[PDB]
Structures are given as structure tokens and as C-alpha cells.
Amino acid sequence: HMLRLSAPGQLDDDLCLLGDVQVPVFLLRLGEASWALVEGGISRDAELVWADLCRWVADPSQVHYWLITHKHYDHCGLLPYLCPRLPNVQVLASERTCQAWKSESAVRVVERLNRQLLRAEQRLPEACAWDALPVRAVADGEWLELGPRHRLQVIEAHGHSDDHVVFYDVRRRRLFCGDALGWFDEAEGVWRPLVFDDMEAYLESLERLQRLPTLLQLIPGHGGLLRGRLAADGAESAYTECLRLCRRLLWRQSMGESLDELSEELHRAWGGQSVHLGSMRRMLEILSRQA
Ligand SMILES: [Fe+3]
Ligand SMILES: [Fe+3]
């Protein structure tokens, strides 16, 4: 499809997709000898992403920044395994996100969730400690002056998770929106809501994101790059789909349906491309809590 770039490699003059489109890691050419990464992947992809990186970047000492949208296992799983190979990298994440990496209970869930994704033959690279990562904490509204042509603004976007942020390149009308709009469904071309924390904050984040200057490029945490109207209308559409799901929880519960009976229907309907179910229930619980 032409409103959506989902192939590994070059997406724009300054931007490549590395690794798997479902859990991509984006690469920004900041300058002749200066690069940046955006989104932190899953752990098992450490060697794939590495191999993909080294095809665009001769010296990895040139990777200076790694931007992280939130703490979930599928958006920072690469950090302990590839940061040691990127000696000059500096990891930029929100205050709450950095605290997750200091929590031992939280780190243990990240590691366990990622380990369920390792293939039979494979083991992982040698790794940093999670509290040893070269990290600089960023705050809502901060400007990340990454290079002469790359200037991104950090925007708090809680709701998907209580730590979530997005990164706006206003020069390029390019939003790295993480999971804040949900999961884009390539089969039907609509967003699927990902509310795993607070529904009001999720809707409020989308309200603010809609007020951004018209997007040209919308880059979620999964699925690749969205352009044209998919980007322009992204935040409004995601907001709409979320409401749509609320009204359907309401409806089906007014007809005596358990959360599970709809947890199954939603898992059956969308879980064949985000492959969870236990996550699927905490969302339906969260939404039915606040309405
Ligand atoms: Fe997430
Ligand atoms: Fe995710």
C-alpha cells in the first residue's frame, strides 16, 4: 500500500527502518558522521537490528542518540544488548521511563516477556545492567537538538502507559508516536486502541496530538511509516476508534457479556497480527472502569 511504508531499509533521505516492521527500530542520519535511533525493539532482534545498522553505519561510535517512547518490553528490549556496541550513544527517555529501568520488579518482567520471544537456537549478546544504561532523562516540552537538520520536541503522551511520550520533528511534520494511537491494522486500515493504563489520559493525549501542525509522516511503534491522510488524520482516527470500542464494551455488557466473552472476540479479531490476551483483558477492564 502507498500511504504506508513498511519495508526494511530507506524510508526517506534521513530515515531508515531496521529490523522487523512489527517491532521496528528507526535510524536517523543526523549528519555525515552522526546518527540516531528511535524505538527500542525486542531483545531477540538484537543481532538482526545490529546487522541492519552496520549496513548503513560504518562506525557505530557515530550513533549518538537513542530515543525511547515508553517502558514496555517491546520498546526497550534491545537496550542492554546493543548499547555496549554503541559507545557514544545517549539514551533519551522520560523521567518515569528511566525509573522503570531502576526498578528490579519491573526490569524482571521486561526480561521475562522478551525471553518468551527467543528462538530455539539463539542466545543473546553480552548485556549491560539495566541501571547501567547511558541514559539522559527528558521532560515534557523539551527540545532534543540532535543535529543541524534534526530538532525534535518531547511531548508527554500518557495513557497507553503511565510513562509514555512521543517525539515531534516539526521541520518534517513527522511524529514518532509510539503506542499512543494504538496499533495500526494493515488489514483494515484503522487503529486498534492500546489503553493499558488510563483511558482519560489516553484520550486527552490524542486530543493534544490532534492540535499539532498537520502531520506528513506518522511513525507508530509498530507497522512502519504512515503518510498522506493516514498521517494527517491519525490522531483523530485513533481517538475515534477508542470511543468506538468503549461504546461496544458498553453495548455488549448491557447484553450480559462477560469481559472474557469480548476479550476472546477482540483477541480472535486482532491478536493474529500482534502475536496479548492477558493484556487484552486489562484494557477491557480499564475502559469499562472509566465509563
Ligand atoms: Fe506498549
Ligand atoms: Fe508496543
Residue numbers in the entry: 0 to 274, 282 to 297
Question: What do the authors of the reporting publication say about this deposited model?
Answer:
PqsE has two biochemical activities, a protein–protein interaction with RhlR, which increases RhlR transcriptional activity at target promoters, and an esterase activity. Curiously, RhlR function additionally depends on the metallo-β-hydrolase enzyme PqsE, encoded as the final gene in the pqsABCDE biosynthetic operon. With respect to RhlR, PqsE is required to form a protein–protein interaction that enhances the affinity of RhlR for target promoters. The effects of the PqsE E182W and PqsE NI substitutions on pyocyanin production are not through impairment of PqsE catalytic function, as the catalytically inactive variant, PqsE(D73A), remains fully capable of interacting with RhlR and driving pyocyanin production. These results indicate that PqsE has two independent functions, catalysis and interaction with RhlR, and it is interaction with RhlR, not catalysis, that is required for virulence. Moreover, the RhlR–PqsE interaction is essential for P. aeruginosa virulence phenotypes, and therefore, of interest as a focus for antibiotic development.
To test whether repositioning of the PqsE E280 residue underpinned the inhibitor mimetic characteristics of the PqsE(E182W) protein, we engineered the E280A substitution into PqsE(E182W) to make PqsE(E182W/E280A). We determined the crystal structure of PqsE(E182W/E280A) revealing further changes in the PqsE active site. In this case, the presence of an alanine at residue 280 eliminated interaction with the iron atoms, and the loop consisting of residues D275-L281 was disordered. The remainder of the loop was ordered and its structure reverted to a conformation that was more native-like than in PqsE(E182W). Consequently, the removal of the glutamate–Fe interaction via the E280A substitution apparently unblocked the active site of PqsE, partially restoring WT activity. Indeed, whereas PqsE(E182W) exhibits reduced binding affinity for the active site fluorescent probe, BB562, PqsE(E182W/E280A) displays WT binding affinity for the probe. The catalytic function of the PqsE(E182W/E280A) variant was greatly improved by the “unblocking” of the active site (34% compared to WT PqsE). Consistent with the repositioning of E280 into the PqsE active site contributing to the increased stability of the PqsE(E182W) protein relative to WT PqsE, introduction of the E280A substitution reduced the Tm of the PqsE(E182W/E280A) protein to nearly that of WT PqsE. Nonetheless, the PqsE(E182W/E280A) variant remains incapable of enhancing RhlR transcription factor activity in an Escherichia coli reporter assay and it does not drive pyocyanin production in P. aeruginosa PA14 (respectively). Analysis of the PqsE(E182W/E280A) structure, and the surprisingly modest conformational changes that are apparent compared to the structures of WT PqsE and PqsE(E182W), suggest that the structural integrity of the G270-L281 loop is essential for PqsE to interact with RhlR.
